[PDB]
Amino acid sequence: DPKIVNIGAVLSTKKHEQIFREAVNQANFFHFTRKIQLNATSVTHRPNAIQMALSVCEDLISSQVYAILVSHPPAPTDHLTPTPISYTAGFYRIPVIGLTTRMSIYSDKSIHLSFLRTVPPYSHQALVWFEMMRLFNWNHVILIVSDDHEGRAAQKKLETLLEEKESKADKVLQFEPGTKNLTALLLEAKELEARVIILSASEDDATAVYKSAAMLDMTGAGYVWLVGEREISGSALRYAPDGIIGLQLINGKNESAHISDAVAVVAQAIHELFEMEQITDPPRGCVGNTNIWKTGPLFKRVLMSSKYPDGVTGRIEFNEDGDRKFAQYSIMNLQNRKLVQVGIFDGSYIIQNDRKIIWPGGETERYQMST
Amino acid sequence: YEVHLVADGKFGTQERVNNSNAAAWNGMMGELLSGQADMIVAPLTINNERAQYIEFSKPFKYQGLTILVKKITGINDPRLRNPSDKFIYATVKQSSVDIYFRRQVELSTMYRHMEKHNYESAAEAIQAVRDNKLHAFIWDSAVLEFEASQKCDLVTTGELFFRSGFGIGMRKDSPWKQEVSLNILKSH
Amino acid sequence: MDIAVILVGTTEEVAIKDVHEKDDFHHLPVTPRVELVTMQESDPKSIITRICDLMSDKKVQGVVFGDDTDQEAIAQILDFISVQTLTPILGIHGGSSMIMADKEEASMFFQFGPSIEQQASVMLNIMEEYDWYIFSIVTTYFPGYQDFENKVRSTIENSFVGWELEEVIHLDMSLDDIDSKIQNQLKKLQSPVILLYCTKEEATYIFEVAHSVGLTGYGFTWIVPSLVAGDTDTVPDEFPTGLISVSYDEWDYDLPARVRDGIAIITTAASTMLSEHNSIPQSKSSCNNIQESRVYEAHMLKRYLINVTFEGRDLSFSEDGYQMHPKLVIILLNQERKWERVGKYKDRSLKMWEHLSIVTLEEAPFVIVE
Numbered sequence: 001d002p003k004i005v006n007i008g009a010v011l012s013t014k015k016h017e018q019i020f021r022e023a024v025n026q027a028n029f030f031h032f033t034r035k036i037q038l039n040a041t042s043v044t045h046r047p048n049a050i051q052m053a054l055s056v057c058e059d060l061i062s063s064q065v066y067a068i069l070v071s072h073p074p075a076p077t078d079h080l081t082p083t084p085i086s087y088t089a090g091f092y093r094i095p096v097i098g099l100t101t102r103m104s105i106y107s108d109k110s111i112h113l114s115f116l117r118t119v120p121p122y123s124h125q126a127l128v129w130f131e132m133m134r135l136f137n138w139n140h141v142i143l144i145v146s147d148d149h150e151g152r153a154a155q156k157k158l159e160t161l162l163e164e165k166e167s168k169a170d171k172v173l174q175f176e177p178g179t180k181n182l183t184a185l186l187l188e189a190k191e192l193e194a195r196v197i198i199l200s201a202s203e204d205d206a207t208a209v210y211k212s213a214a215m216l217d218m219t220g221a222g223y224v225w226l227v228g229e230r231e232i233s234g235s236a237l238r239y240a241p242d243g244i245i246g247l248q249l250i251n252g253k254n255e256s257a258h259i260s261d262a263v264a265v266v267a268q269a270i271h272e273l274f275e276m277e278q279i280t281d282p283p284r285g286c287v288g289n290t291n292i293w294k295t296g297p298l299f300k301r302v303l304m305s306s307k308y309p310d311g312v313t314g315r316i317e318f319n320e321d322g323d324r325k326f327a328q329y330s331i332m333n334l335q336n337r338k339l340v341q342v343g344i345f346d347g348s349y350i351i352q353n354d355r356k357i358i359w360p361g362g363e364t365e366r367y368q369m370s371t
Numbered sequence: 372y373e374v375h376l377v378a379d380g381k382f383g384t385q386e387r388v389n390n391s392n393a394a395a396w397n398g399m400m401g402e403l404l405s406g407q408a409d410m411i412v413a414p415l416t417i418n419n420e421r422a423q424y425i426e427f428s429k430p431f432k433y434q435g436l437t438i439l440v441k442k443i444t445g446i447n448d449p450r451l452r453n454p455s456d457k458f459i460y461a462t463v464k465q466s467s468v469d470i471y472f473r474r475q476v477e478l479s480t481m482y483r484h485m486e487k488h489n490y491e492s493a494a495e496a497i498q499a500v501r502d503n504k505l506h507a508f509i510w511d512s513a514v515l516e517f518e519a520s521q522k523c524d525l526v527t528t529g530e531l532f533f534r535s536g537f538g539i540g541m542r543k544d545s546p547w548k549q550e551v552s553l554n555i556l557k558s559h
Numbered sequence: 560m561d562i563a564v565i566l567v568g569t570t571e572e573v574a575i576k577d578v579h580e581k582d583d584f585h586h587l588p589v590t591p592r593v594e595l596v597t598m599q600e601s602d603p604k605s606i607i608t609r610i611c612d613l614m615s616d617k618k619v620q621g622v623v624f625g626d627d628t629d630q631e632a633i634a635q636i637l638d639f640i641s642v643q644t645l646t647p648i649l650g651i652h653g654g655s656s657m658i659m660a661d662k663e664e665a666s667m668f669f670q671f672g673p674s675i676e677q678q679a680s681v682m683l684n685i686m687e688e689y690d691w692y693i694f695s696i697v698t699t700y701f702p703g704y705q706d707f708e709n710k711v712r713s714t715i716e717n718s719f720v721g722w723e724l725e726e727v728i729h730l731d732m733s734l735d736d737i738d739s740k741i742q743n744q745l746k747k748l749q750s751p752v753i754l755l756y757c758t759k760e761e762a763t764y765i766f767e768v769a770h771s772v773g774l775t776g777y778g779f780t781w782i783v784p785s786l787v788a789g790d791t792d793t794v795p796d797e798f799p800t801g802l803i804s805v806s807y808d809e810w811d812y813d814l815p816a817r818v819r820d821g822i823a824i825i826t827t828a829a830s831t832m833l834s835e836h837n838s839i840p841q842s843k844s845s846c847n848n849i850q851e852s853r854v855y856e857a858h859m860l861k862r863y864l865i866n867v868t869f870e871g872r873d874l875s876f877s878e879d880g881y882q883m884h885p886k887l888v889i890i891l892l893n894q895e896r897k898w899e900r901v902g903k904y905k906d907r908s909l910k911m912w913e914h915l916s917i918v919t920l921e922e923a924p925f926v927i928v929e
Contacts, residue, residue, distance in 0.1 A: 088604075
């Protein structure tokens with residue numbers, strides 16, 4: 001006899017819903033249909049958070065979903081519109097999986113404990129910057145961060161990375177929101193011996209940073225720039241200095257691949273789960289259940305450990321925070337005021353592309369001697 | 372070389388906020404880590420608590436604590452050991468000597484008697500003995516002996532205890548210190 | 560003003576909720592208008608649905624949520640809702656009171672709860688009260704570690720006193736052990752006073768292991784932050800007796816009293832914002848459509864709204880959204896299964912409730928009276 005196991009998701013468009021159902025059917029076909037079968041239920045994004053959370057409790061959870069997928073909407077509203085569901089699902093410990101949403105605030109297990117993603121954050125980007133450090137064979141650098149969970153987490157990332165090795169604090173610089181003009185802090189930066197510079201910021205902020213930095217001519221040779229991906233895009237892109245080193249993610253704006261792979265992982269996870277006994281179906285409907293779903297954390301545990309390295313997006317594994325691991329970034333250069341790939345980073349090791357390097361200043365490729 | 376004196380009169384001490392480890396030791400040392408000054412030239416005693424943070428140049432001179440009284444058997448004086456409200460023994464709160472008193476468990480009892488009737492600065496502390504307000508004064512010799520010569524109304528007594536060497540501060544990362552010590556020895 | 564409050568479970572309609580607010584603060588120039596709804600059973604779909612549906616019938620500018628539930632998730636869901644409506648929501652007991660992830664700055668949310676650093680502080684105050692100077696910390700990789708260590712390092716370090724930290728132990732619940740590696744570490748420690756930090760279940764395993772190790776026995780004592788005791792309704796006796804832990808108050812505020820406090824906070828905030836700008840806080844509540852215009856002004860209110868006071872008592876919140884002046888109780892495991900209150904603690908300060916007698920006389924130096 002068969003058993004029907006529901007899944008649920010929220011996606012940008014109905015076409016992607018069909019892609020989802022198709023992928024689900026692919027999962028059913030390639031794994032035993034005699035023991036178990038998978039069923040899909042879904043709903044469109046609602047304009048606000050509340051209609052959507054209500055949709056989860058009513059339209060999805062009434063189908064007894066064992067898990068949920070979520071994607072960023074076609075027109076982003078504020079940020080993290082997939083904030084609520086993770087909360088609503090978080091209530092029953094029903095696992096949530098994002099295709100999209102690079103947001104770092106989901107990295108904290110505390111606030112979102114059901115949240116897993118087929119991507120990463122910005123703090124972990126420092127690994128690249130750290131990986132970048134291998135390349136320049138310089139231990140002394142400078143870090144400029146905005147003041148928020150993002151920047152401070154980033155600081156934590158470089159420092160945690162640095163701690164296993166001999167501790168490196170060449171310099172650190174923190175700034176506060178809303179100050180269009182920051183010149184003095186960089187004036188402080190110049191006094192520091194270390195000749196390499198690195199920064200993380202909000203979209204508006206990177207502009208002000210480069211604008212102030214160019215004024216003190218910190219963009220010149222003997223000075224270097226390393227930066228985050230979000231920062232480089234938009235108006236900041238217009239004002240960016242030459243020869244900067246920059247970062248770019250892969251398969252981040254594509255829901256469908258992440259859909260097929262995420263659902264594949266879900267299938268593998270479920271099939272791995274039912275090998276164990278004392279399973280309980282998730283609560284039927286939002287209505288009448290004040291209690292969590294005991295299986296959910298276990299489902300999370302297997303799902304985080306769920307391997308299946310072959311996937312359309314790439315290898316699949318989850319870090320402690322539930323964030324995706326061994327992710328790949330593409331290194332970027334500012335050559336001729338245009339974005340170019342000097343190299344690409346995959347796995348724990350960087351890879352150098354044949355392409356010419358860009359460095360800041362009158363250098364094709366570029367500590368400082370203080371007399 | 373270009374030299375500027377540190378804004379804070381103190382050389383340095385760890386302080387301020389609780390979360391994680393917050394801020395940094397106030398004073399010229401703090402400037403050294405901050406890079407406000409890349410190298411520190413001053414009369415700085417050399418100790419392990421500081422030593423982990425920074426590289427230290429070889430010492431070229433020695434000195435220890437002692438007592439000034441107008442003309443005390445030992446660093447351990449029964450007279451100290453037999454304190455009296457009548458016989459004062461005076462020091463500066465927040466002077467490193469006070470750190471010796473607080474950090475050290477073995478004499479930890481003896482600290483409190485010293486804590487009473489503390490003076491804010493060196494001039495006032497010498498003056499009290501000179502004014503005869505306070506019968507005894509405790510401070511490191513290098514500051515004290517010069518004064519001992521300066522008046523001779525007052526005298527230093529006993530054997531320098533809790534002494535230590537003085538050296539030039541540099542970050543561990545800076546290799547110039549390697550020459551500095553190498554030079555210091557050559558100067559010795 | 561327009562306000563709504565909800566109570567979940569207990570299987571009851573109860574008079575006391577009107578009794579709670581007992582038409583409280585009627586004196587205030589602006590009057591609260593309240594619509595009450597209860598639900599026997601909760602769902603993220605159900606809970607999400609009902610409050611917005613209520614938005615359609617009430618168009619309330621504030622919400623208070625309360626539950627009979629032990630469920631962790633509900634609070635977080637409500638944080639999401641705060642993010643969604645930009646309409647303030649708070650909760651006075653149960654899951655909403657239970658701790659949650661760091662709240663989005665844009666979001667407006669309040670809980671009758673607290674944090675980790677504060678709890679550690681209370682643990683220190685408790686230890687100081689009994690003058691237990693010497694202690695160790697057993698922790699797990701569970702969130703907040705070495706921030707717990709860090710907070711303790713500052714709190715313990717600043718004080719003049721020579722108390723001793725003996726050991727700090729970090730053990731992963733994951734990679735579960737045949738080796739009894741937890742037994743292997745835990746057996747080592749000789750210290751009388753132990754601070755433990757972990758998930759509740761992990762606490763069960765660690766305690767079984769401690770019972771094997773002999774660490775639970777007399778003269779050693781254990782002290783715990785909020786998480787292990789949790790609801791306190793259910794207590795595996797795997798926990799040793801004499802276990803000392805901190806938890807939210809109960810006999811201090813009735814479910815109705817707490818709701819009265821919440822209503823008072825919302826309407827006091829409304830009153831202060833009024834006094835400042837002479838402007839009605841009332842806003843369109845409907846989630847389904849775009850958030851109402853002028854809802855953005857509410858932002859200033861929250862910045863202003865963080866500390867709210869009634870009855871000469873602080874409801875003052877903190878940046879996380881937990882009472883900036885939340886109230887707390889020192890609790891112990893009474894013999895058998897009982898959880899019995901011992902001390903109360905609030906804001907800065909805490910208050911908690913072979914013999915051979917010898918006689919002497921004061922002499923020269925031998926026996927000195929001071």
